Amino acid sequence: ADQLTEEQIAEFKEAFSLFDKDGDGTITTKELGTVMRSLGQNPTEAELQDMINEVDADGNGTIDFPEFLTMMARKMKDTDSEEEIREAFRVFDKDGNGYISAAELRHVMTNLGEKLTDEEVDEMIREANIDGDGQVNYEEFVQMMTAK
């Protein structure tokens, strides 16, 4: 669960820094809207308040960088997902740098849970361009998951 893409997250942290009271990096619901505006968006104190009213139970009342991503992803509705997927595979890439196990891979399909039931993912994993024992070019699986 790395939320948006590392890049968008990089520029986000920057904003999260421009606004940092605890000196650590977190911010207060009050500066929230101010941070969202700095990122490059233009939310409304209304919806912005709708999210705060929720995270207003952390105990301290302040929001941390991660929690801020969550509320930030709800407005942007994540990306093309191609990111959460690519990483889903790296979670196993043991130096292979280009291939992952087919078994574990099947597990990745369980985490995402798109629209390819085991039967669909099976017919695929069955011939995902394999050749060795059970390796799979996750890279090809990342795009081949969308195809036409």
Swiss-Prot record:
Database matches in InterPro entries: CALM/Myosin/TropC-like (IPR050230), EF-hand-dom_pair (IPR011992), EF_Hand_1_Ca_BS (IPR018247), EF_hand_dom (IPR002048)
Organism superkingdom: Eukaryota
List of residues binding Ca(2+) 2: 56, 58, 60, 62, 67
Keyword set, alphabetical order: Acetylation, Calcium, Metal-binding, Methylation, Repeat
Keyword Repeat: yes
GO cellular component, one term: myosin II complex
Binding site for Ca(2+) 4: 129, 131, 133, 135, 140
EF-hand domain sequence ranges: 7-42, 43-78, 80-115, 116-148
Record-listed Ca(2+) 1 binding positions: 20, 22, 24, 26, 31
Residues where N-acetylalanine is found: 1
A GO term for molecular function: calcium ion binding
N6,N6,N6-trimethyllysine modifications at: 115
Family listed: Belongs to the calmodulin family.
Role of this protein: Calmodulin acts as part of a calcium signal transduction pathway by mediating the control of a large number of enzymes, ion channels, aquaporins and other proteins through calcium-binding. Calcium-binding is required for the activation of calmodulin. Among the enzymes to be stimulated by the calmodulin-calcium complex are a number of protein kinases, such as myosin light-chain kinases and calmodulin-dependent protein kinase type II (CaMK2), and phosphatases.
Miscellaneous note of the record: This protein has four functional calcium-binding sites.
This protein's name: Calmodulin-1
